[PDB]
Ligand binder design. Structure first.
Ligand SMILES: O=S1(=O)CCC[C@@H](Nc2ncnc3[nH]ccc23)C1
Length: 167
């Protein structure tokens, strides 16, 4: 039993809710919140901008030190950093950005990072400003993640469509 509430169960291991991931993180304090990161960990907008703002920019400060030491992530890759006031840990995962021309097949590689964590609160990778089709992102998620994932979808209209079209 865990503290996630109000989610629709899609499969054995994938759950979905119309929620603001920032508000959900602050209420649940999950072990892991996933950030929709870019390779530079520049958390300017979308989910990343919102998570970073909720940490009062502490996420960005930590991220800048990470990059200065380690260099950029790979598209499809991830790193574990602090969750600050939102979670124990933040798993920064880089899905492909269609608006940069990145290969969509890398979306499966991006979701494979979730399998290193038993339970996660997450957004749909490569959705929103990353330009992929969220219905496709949900399909890849369900077909790739085997650990327990709680998906937060900010837009109610999109949430209803994802549910209504889910096979
Ligand atoms: O274009 S996006 O930002 C790309 C990443 C996922 C979507 N965003 C969110 N999803 C869930 N909670 C959120 N709180 C603030 C933004 C947000 C759309």
């Amino acid at each position: 039993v865990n503290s996630f509430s109000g989610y629709l169960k899609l499969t054995d291991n994938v759950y979905i809710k119309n929620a603001d991931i920032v508000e959900e993180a602050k209420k649940v304090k999950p072990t892991v919140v996933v950030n929709a990161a870019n390779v530079y960990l520049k958390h300017g907008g979308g989910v990343a901008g919102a998570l970073n703002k909720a940490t009062n920019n502490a996420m960005q400060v930590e991220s800048d030190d990470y990059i200065a030491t380690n260099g950029p992530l790979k598209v499809g890759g991830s790193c574990v950093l602090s969750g600050h006031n939102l979670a124990k840990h933040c798993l920064h995962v880089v899905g492909p950005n269609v608006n940069k021309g990145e290969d969509i097949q890398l979306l499966k590689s991006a979701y494979e990072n979730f399998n290193q964590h038993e339970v996660l609160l997450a957004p749909l990778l490569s959705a929103g400003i990353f330009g992929a089709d969220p219905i496709h992102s949900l399909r890849v998620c369900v077909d790739t993640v085997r650990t327990n994932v709680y998906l937060a979808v900010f837009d109610k209209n999109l949430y209803d469509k994802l549910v209504s079209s889910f096979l």
